[PDB]
Design a protein around this ligand. Sequence first.
Ligand SMILES: NC(=O)c1ccc[n+]([C@@H]2O[C@H](COP(=O)([O-])OP(=O)(O)OC[C@H]3O[C@@H](n4cnc5c(N)ncnc54)[C@H](OP(=O)(O)O)[C@@H]3O)[C@@H](O)[C@H]2O)c1
Ligand SMILES: CCCCC[C@H](O)/C=C/[C@H]1C(=O)C[C@H](O)[C@@H]1C/C=C\CCCC(=O)O
Length: 319
Amino acid sequence: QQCVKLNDGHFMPVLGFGTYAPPEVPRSKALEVTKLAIEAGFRHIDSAHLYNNEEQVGLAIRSKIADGSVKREDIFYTSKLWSTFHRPELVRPALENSLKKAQLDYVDLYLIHSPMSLKPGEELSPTDENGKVIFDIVDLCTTWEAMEKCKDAGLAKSIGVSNFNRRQLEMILNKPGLKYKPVCNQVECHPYFNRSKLLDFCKSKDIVLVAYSALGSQRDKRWVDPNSPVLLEDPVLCALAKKHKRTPALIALRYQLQRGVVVLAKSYNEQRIRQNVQVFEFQLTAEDMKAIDGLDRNLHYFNSDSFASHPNYPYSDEY
Ligand SMILES: NC(=O)c1ccc[n+]([C@@H]2O[C@H](COP(=O)([O-])OP(=O)(O)OC[C@H]3O[C@@H](n4cnc5c(N)ncnc54)[C@H](OP(=O)(O)O)[C@@H]3O)[C@@H](O)[C@H]2O)c1
Ligand SMILES: CCCCC[C@H](O)/C=C/[C@H]1C(=O)C[C@H](O)[C@@H]1C/C=C\CCCC(=O)O
């Protein structure tokens, strides 16, 4: 593996394990594959309240610690604050609940899952009488103040954000009396949506860009148009796969590592989980990288059109 030093002083393994799996998959699977991931060499594990799996992921971690395979400090665990808990008073309590579910003392990284606040409540997707998801108006800077408090209280070693654009990031960065800068910004990032501009900006403020859907997403027919191009079927990626004798997924992952992006990779398949750790075994040439750079088509796999009306919709800006 390898690590990147956060503007926190803390370290984040550049390769992370994505734990989300559709509700159709047995929750016992999350437990089994997280163990497989750790056994394969994954040290960074990505979860969230929304995934309904923190109990299982924490179970796997606890199990591998008892195994003697790893120590708590060897694992980098991240969870995320769901959008229905943006009001400052619901932040610590939300974190405490995640910690309780995972049976952990602290989270290595806690993130604001998305800038699009939703009506407060236990329900993850609040909708009105007309079936429309209910938005909420919250000063994200106050949400951030509550996050900084969680870090001071030792519940989260590092704090960051997710799905934020440059303007939203700047809101935090320019907040009067700011104590902690977000350590990262976890966003959708892959060759068909490489986020070069955002990447350059984050790099300029020492903020780490963490890539999700780096392998082209899980293409859930619920939020992903089946007509969208299949990333792992890209001719250039496959050509580079056949050239380096690797796989399109490894090419996509290596692309991010070489451009300074921390990459997440979800897989509930034993062989693929183990294959993904091989991303550290090869290297792409400067020319290889330029070729992948030319693949961008501003394609966002998640169908976010329904929230396009949200005042905090991140895709309103060029980046
Ligand atoms: N903060 C956010 O808003 C946000 C949003 C989305 C996701 N995330 C996080 O980032 C993670 C990754 O994103 P994602 O869920 O879209 O998944 P992804 O990593 O883009 O998914 C890659 C898909 O390709 C397959 N795959 C994995 N390794 C492969 C390999 N070596 N060769 C061929 N196919 C391979 C997997 O299927 P198999 O399981 O069959 O291997 C997986 O479904 C999530 O699990 C989650 O932790 C965060
Ligand atoms: C415009 C881009 C911002 C979208 C950010 C958003 O957090 C994305 C979340 C996705 C994950 O992390 C995995 C998970 O399946 C989830 C899928 C998408 C929407 C669930 C909305 C329903 C609810 O309310 O629960």
